Amino acid sequence: QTSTSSLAKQLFQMTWPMLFGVLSLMSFQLVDSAFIGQLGVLPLAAQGFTMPIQMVIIGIQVGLGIATTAVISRAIGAGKTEYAKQLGGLVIVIGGIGVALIALVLYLLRQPLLGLLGAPETVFAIIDHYWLWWLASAWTGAMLYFYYSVCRANGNTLLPGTLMMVTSVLNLILDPIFIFTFDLGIDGAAIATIIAFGVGIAIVAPKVAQRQWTSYQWQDLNISQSLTALGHIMGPAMLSQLLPPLSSMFATKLLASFGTAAVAAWALGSRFEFFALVAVLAMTMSLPPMIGRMLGAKEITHIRQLVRIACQFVLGFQLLIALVTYVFATPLAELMTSETEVSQILNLHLVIVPISLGALGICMLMVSVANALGKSYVALTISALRLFAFYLPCLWLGAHFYGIEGLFIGALVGNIIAGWAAWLAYQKALRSENLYFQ
Questions:
Q1: Ramachandran category for residue 27: left, alpha or beta (phi over 0 → left; psi -120 to 50 → alpha)
Q2: How far apart are CA 70 and CA 376, in angstroms?
């Protein structure tokens, strides 16, 4: 019982700085789009069509980020200390030229890209200069995220957590000064972001250097073997990032049949689910470094107990949230929209699907755990099964049988199955590591 009491406290200490950090990363877009909306309906439109290429950049840095925390933490647990810090340096370099090249082709192909997006011609003139400064800000934030990943890979979420809170406040402060005071317009938003992320890097990188968590002496470092280890995780991880938007392109057609109010209500419903799962979202970044280290240290029993502690919190925590959401469903629904038609559909959503977020959270958790064990294809399978085998089919069946209410019932059932399938997938994955048992 002292084992589960020690692990629960550790998981808590690792999670809460990421709980504050998730919200901070979150607000960068909401704060930026807030100030730019003041510039007119057209600059605000330019930001809207920046959202897709942002998902691409975000998906890449996360895909790599998941890979680094998995292989480096495992290397540390295995005692391969020098190899770990060599890996950290390699990631910073590989992440640098990689994102830079991606930012290149995105700009060279912006006119066909905006074409597929269905962007108006009036928008094109703005993107031609705004994406110049924005892609620079996206690259800088990527580098900061990589240093964040190295810190997490070394078992630290505190420094990334505070730096997420620092840079976000900085971006809030700097935006009006650059946008309005300096009369830079929409580019001032991107430029202020660069400075904000630049301050973070200027803080985290020297501190990483002190602890020697990064190294660029690669004489005895097998580079091709290291990039193979990273690519094995990073590849499938990026593929998983593509599944939710590719699921929406199916899901949107179904919701379109229920009218304009139902579509708007679904958008508000998704935004709420994201907020109700910030704890699990914080645990998808705090838990994997712990798992990876334990796997390398051959502490299998700790992994078993740590995951079970994590699972029991999520299941109980989301049940309470679902309960509180229920009794305040009507004032919550009428707070988020002024349109009556939308309020009533959102209300129906808030009393049906939040109870399923406990199971969905486990599904999210097992995906990150699988990646932490190095089982990137298991993690990809769970994500693919969640959306295409369980979620969308249940959404369709519910809508067909019992309309807009049944569709929400479908979301409920789909999440319970997905989470139960995820738990079964994790169990099978941990049994593969039993050769290291004690």
A1: alpha
A2: 10
Backbone angles phi, psi at 437, to 5 degrees: -65, 110
Residue owning tokens 């699972």 = 311
249 vs 112: CA distance, rounded Å: 20
Quote the strand ranges of 149-219, DSSP E.
Answer: none
Domain residue extents for the chain: 1-438
Number of CB atoms found within 10 A of residue 221's CB: 17
Cβ pair 295, 433 in contact under 8 A: yes
Both tokens of 391, joined, read 């979620």
- 244: which 2 tokens? 């939710």
Of 140, 137, 143, the residue nearest 89 (C-alpha): 143
In angstroms, rounded to a whole number, what is the distance separating the alpha carbons of residues 323 and 53?
A: 37
Resolution (angstroms) equals 2.5
- Helix ranges (H only) for 276-391 are 278-296, 300-327, 329-336, 340-350, 357-372, 376-384
Structure tokens at 412: 């409920």
Using CA atoms, how far apart are residues 94 and 71, in angstroms rounded to an integer? 15
